[model samples]
Target: EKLKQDILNLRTDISTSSSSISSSEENDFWQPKPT
Candidate 1:
């Protein structure tokens, strides 16, 4: 289960990296939520 766990951890890292890139261009993906 270690391999699976590591993959999950990588997924987490990737998600965080993507969010970091987004902050670099947060305006590139701006959208307003309608209430």
Candidate 2:
């Protein structure tokens, strides 16, 4: 199914051309106030 391919691509998207597996993600930081 097409859905199966989506997940496979997601892995490549994260790994390929990325500096590190876990670094500088939005969720890694917290905002003090709403924009």
Candidate 3:
């Protein structure tokens, strides 16, 4: 049960990290290009 909890915790960390990175990329996508 402890091992299962550890795995679940790691998965949650990865999910949040992926989400933050995705938002950063999407924010850049909407920026205007420099001339």
Candidate topping lDDT:
2
For all candidates in order, the CA lDDT equals 0.49, 0.54, 0.49
TM value for model 3? 0.15
lDDT per residue (tens digit) for residues 1-35 in model 3? 24344355654433445434443465645677696
What TM-scores do the predictions have?
A: 0.18, 0.16, 0.15
For residues 1-35, what per-residue lDDT tens digits would candidate 2 score against the true structure? 24344455655444455556555556756766776
Candidate 1 at residue 13, lDDT? 38
**Candidate 1 C-alpha error for residue 29, in Å:** 5.5
List of clashing residue pairs for candidate 1: none
Superposed model 1: Cα runs more than 4 Å off = 1-9, 12-29
- Candidate 2, number of clashes: 0
How well is each residue in 1-35 modelled by candidate 1, as lDDT tens digits? 24344445554433444334444664557677786
